[PDB]
């Protein structure tokens, strides 16, 4: 009969969960500003390296002179051996390769939650907002993997040198600048593309494969198609599931993309009503454990691994994730049946953290 309704608690843009999660325009503009700085520097580093290559096209300069030239650019912020390597790579280029490099101008495209608007304000101390800004290198389906990575690293490392409180982190799939004071990091995955999703190649930092075909547009188009198909509330509930994950784990938990994929599957196959996103979240929560136990398939069919493994592959971390997923619909049910508004709030905040504090967003209802 009587039940607490949480639709405002979730959706209210003043001080409900959407209000707590969505970045303000100032914050978004700050991120855009950070993105521009990184893009400009990467553009500049490539122009600088191209200037050296241009000089070598004109005259077959000695190795020591090429090295000296490298030392005057932003590449000076790489290690000595890495500078030697860039100089050696420029020295060793054949005419064809050098011409291709002289024709290369990096392009950029943001992928991930800043692009499709699911980027949440961070919650726990230590957690950071993420901007995924890819750099793209148009090439014949002729510039080498090593040189390209060194130049993008030169870019990021040169900014890290100039800015107090910025730090560089090498990842398998990107370079990363972390800005702890701003609770932000920017990831720069690097792609080779033709000068056709099959030809978008993501550079890998280590291993048996230098490249793998992984077009971020596949996920972006899948998600935006899903939003059109299911409704705008898809973005809201994905934000909320990510907020749940940030509240349950300081570090770790299921990936954002696994939560998106499982949520889309559920909302495509189970009736729900966007006029009550509290019920919609309860419905999602009821079905997530089965989605995750069987393994969460990627929306990109070319991915070699699922986004979350099936339960026969579970270790302590996946077991912990299954446990918290199993608890979530119980938390939501108990909040619905709580004795008072204040207890309803206390209970639902055990799912999403103590972010929403306004118990007037919770209203007595019937269901």
Ligand X SMILES: Nc1nc2c(ncn2[C@@H]2O[C@H](COP(=O)(O)OP(=O)(O)OP(=O)(O)O)C[C@H]2O)c(=O)[nH]1
Q: Which residues are annotated as a binding site for ATP?
A: 176, 214
The residue among 110 and 349 lying less far from Mg ion, judged by its C-beta, is 110
- Work out how close the CB of 350 gets to ligand X at its nearest, in angstroms, rounded to a whole number: 21
Task: Give 186's strand partners.
Answer: 131, 177
- Work out how close the CB of 182 gets to Mg ion at its nearest, in angstroms, rounded to a whole number: 15
Going through 30-150 in order, the beta strands assigned E by DSSP cover 107-111, 129-139
The residue assigned the tokens 């101390």 is: 125
- Does residue number 307 form part of the binding site for ligand X (CB under 6 A)? yes
List binders of ligand X among 44-73 (CB under 6 A): none
- Work out how close the CB of 257 gets to ligand X at its nearest, in angstroms, rounded to a whole number: 5
**Using the rule CB under 6 A, which residue among 190, 219, 230, 264 binds ligand X?**
219
d(CA 103, CA 90) in angstroms, rounded, equals 15
Terminal CA-CA length for the chain: 6
How would you label 231-248 residue by residue, b for 16+ Cβ within 10 Å and e otherwise?
A: eebbbbbbbbbbbbbbbb
- Work out how close the CB of 237 gets to Mg ion at its nearest, in angstroms, rounded to a whole number: 18
List the single partner that 42 binds among Mg ion, Na ion, ligand X, none, CB under 5 to 8 Å by kind. none
How would you label 151-177 residue by residue, b for 16+ Cβ within 10 Å and e otherwise?
A: bbbbbbbbbbeeeeebebeeeebbbbb
List binders of ligand X among 153-212 (CB under 6 A): 171, 173-174, 187, 189, 202
Rg (the chain; Cα; Å): 24
List binders of Mg ion among 170-189 (CB under 5 A): 187
List the single partner that 254 binds among Na ion, ligand X, Mg ion, none, CB under 5 to 8 Å by kind. none
List the single partner that 213 binds among ligand X, Mg ion, Na ion, none, CB under 5 to 8 Å by kind. none
List binders of Na ion among 288-347 (CB under 5 A): 324, 327-328
How would you label 264-302 residue by residue, b for 16+ Cβ within 10 Å and e otherwise?
A: bbbbeeeebebebbbbbbbbbbbbbbebbbebbbbbbee
The residue among 117 and 343 lying less far from Mg ion, judged by its C-beta, is 117
Query: Which SS3 state, helix, strand or coil, does residue 174 take?
Result: coil
Q: Which residues in this chain contact Mg ion in the complex, by CB under 5 A?
A: 112-113, 130, 132, 187
| Interface residues toward Na ion, by CB under 5 A | 324, 327-328
């Amino acid at each position: 009969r009587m039940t607490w309704n949480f639709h405002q608690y979730y959706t209210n843009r003043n001080d409900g969960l959407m209000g707590k999660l969505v970045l303000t325009d100032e914050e978004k503009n700050n991120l855009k500003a950070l993105r521009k700085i990184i893009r400009l520097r990467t553009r500049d580093v490539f122009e600088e390296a191209k200037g050296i290559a241009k000089a070598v096209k004109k005259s077959a300069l000695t190795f020591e002179i090429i090295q000296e030239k490298v030392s005057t650019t932003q590449i000076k912020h790489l290690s000595d051996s890495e500078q030697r390597e860039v100089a050696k790579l420029i020295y060793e280029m054949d005419d064809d390769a050098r011409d291709e490099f002289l024709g290369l101008t990096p392009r950029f495209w943001t992928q991930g939650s800043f692009q499709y608007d699911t980027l949440n304000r961070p919650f726990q101390p230590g957690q950071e907002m993420d901007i995924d800004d890819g750099t793209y290198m148009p090439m014949p389906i002729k510039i080498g993997h090593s040189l390209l990575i060194l130049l993008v690293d030169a870019s990021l490392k040169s900014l890290v040198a100039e800015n107090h409180g910025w730090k560089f982190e090498a990842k398998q799939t990107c370079g990363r600048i972390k800005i702890e004071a701003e609770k932000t990091h920017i990831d720069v995955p690097m792609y080779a593309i033709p000068k056709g999703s099959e030809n978008v190649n993501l550079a890998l930092r280590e291993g048996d494969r230098k490249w793998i075909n992984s077009d971020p547009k596949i996920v972006e188009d899948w998600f935006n198609d899903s939003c059109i198909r299911i409704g705008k509330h898809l973005r809201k509930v994905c934000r909320f599931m990510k907020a749940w994950r940030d509240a349950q784990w300081d570090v770790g938990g299921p990936s954002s993309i696994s939560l998106m994929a499982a949520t889309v599957n559920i909302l495509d196959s189970v009736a729900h009503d966007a006029s009550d996103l509290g019920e919609t979240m309860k419905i999602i929560a009821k079905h997530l454990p089965s989605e995750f136990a069987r393994g969460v398939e990627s929306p990109d069919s070319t991915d070699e691994k699922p986004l979350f493994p099936p339960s026969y592959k579970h270790g302590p971390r996946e077991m912990d994730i299954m446990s918290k997923l199993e608890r979530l619909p119980e938390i939501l049910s108990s909040a619905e049946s709580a004795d008072s508004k204040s207890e309803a709030l206390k209970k639902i905040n055990m799912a999403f953290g103590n972010r929403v504090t306004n118990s007037e967003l919770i209203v007595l209802a019937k269901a």
